[PDB]
Amino acid sequence: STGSATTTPIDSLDDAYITPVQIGTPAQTLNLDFDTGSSDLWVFSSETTASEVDGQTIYTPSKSTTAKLLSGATWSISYGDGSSSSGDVYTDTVSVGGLTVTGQAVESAKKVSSSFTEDSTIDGLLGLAFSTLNTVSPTQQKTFFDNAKASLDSPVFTADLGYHAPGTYNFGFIDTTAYTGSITYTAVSTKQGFWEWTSTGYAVGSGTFKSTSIDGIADTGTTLLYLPATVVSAYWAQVSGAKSSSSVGGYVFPCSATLPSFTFGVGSARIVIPGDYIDFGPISTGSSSCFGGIQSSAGIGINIFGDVALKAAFVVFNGATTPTLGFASK
Question: Looking at 199, 261, 296, 297, which residue is catalytic?
Fold first, then answer.
């Protein structure tokens, strides 16, 4: 089997991407944030505290003939941005882009933090990191990908995120029309439960490539590119008037600037992030200070190749017995 679904930016900045997902019988379609940095499929639901719901579409298990309470199971998750959610668990039929899993754990939110409530466009998350990170207790659950894997034509999914445009998540096949040149594959460590890999270095603009190992995660659920402070300082030094602002919480730059590109290494291959991908616009409405898309990871504890980086590439998440990542230009 295969699946193929379009993923659509939630706003004009590509802050996140939503992908329609069918849950239950008859289908209830919710728009989920596919997140390769977490392992829970959770939804706004009929159980979510009413004051914490503001515009989201909800999953109502009582209206699904295939929903079953997963008795005694609870979940609770905290993300790197300080947001959180928790609740109880149903199993139900879940389809993405024509690919169906029966018996998927659908984590129903009883509580969500303010950042979720305030984002009316995201009806929940679909985690695509390794199932070792799934938070269901006392019986850990599998991701949608792990439950689909044995049925897929190939044990892979691909992320093809757009810049200010829709893109595609595919499951079970590699669309050879969706990228240019060849795919460079690189090793993955699953020790922390992430798609963790090691970039071979970077360049700023037309500058020379610096060969240096940068361990980080491929995380579709993170907007920006978070790299070591040395790398980030070297980037922003090429932008007149850029500075790190403790009041704003990262590097800002004059909105009048033209940003340089940023290149990262994948083995001997190179992925170029155009400068315009690194512009996240005014820090507040009407400001002439703009927020940068490359930020320091120093306060996180891991480097994160978020959407800024991934949307410059066609990315293969290879879930074979020995997982690997692949990157191609596009």
Answer: 199
